[PDB]
Amino acid sequence: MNEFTQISGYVNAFGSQRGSVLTVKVENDEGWTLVEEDFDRADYGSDPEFVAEVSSYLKRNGGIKDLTKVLTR
Numbered sequence: 001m002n003e004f005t006q007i008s009g010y011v012n013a014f015g016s017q018r019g020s021v022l023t024v025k026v027e028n029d030e031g032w033t034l035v036e037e038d039f040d041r042a043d044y045g046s047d048p049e050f051v052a053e054v055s056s057y058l059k060r061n062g063g064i065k066d067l068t069k070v071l072t073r
Contacts, residue, residue, distance in 0.1 A: 007055065011064040015054070024054050026062035029070050034062035 002023065004016035012027035018038075025036030037057055044050040059065070062072070 007058070007063070009066045010055075010058070011068040013055075013058050013063045022050075022054060024058045026058045028062070028072065029068060034072060037061065 002016045002018040004014035004023065004025065007013040007015050007024070010026065011029070012031070014023075014025050014027065014033075016023040016025070020042070021038055021040030023036065023038045025033045027033045035058075037054075039050065039054045039057070041047065041050050044053065055063070064071070
């Protein structure tokens with residue numbers, strides 16, 4: 001059911017979907033998932049909210065946009 005899929009436009013972030021709720025993780029160049037979050041759409045009031053908040057969260061948590069930066073805040 002759950003299947004991590006690499007997110008287009010991030011260093012190595014994967015969004016594994018699991019029945020409405022999405023697992024949005026961020027991996028470094030080291031292949032290590034630096035942080036990982038799960039977001040169920042029942043938390044939000046809209047899908048756009050969700051997709052915005054979701055990819056923006058992993059972004060703010062470790063997801064570097066297409067550029068791949070080994071930084072780690």
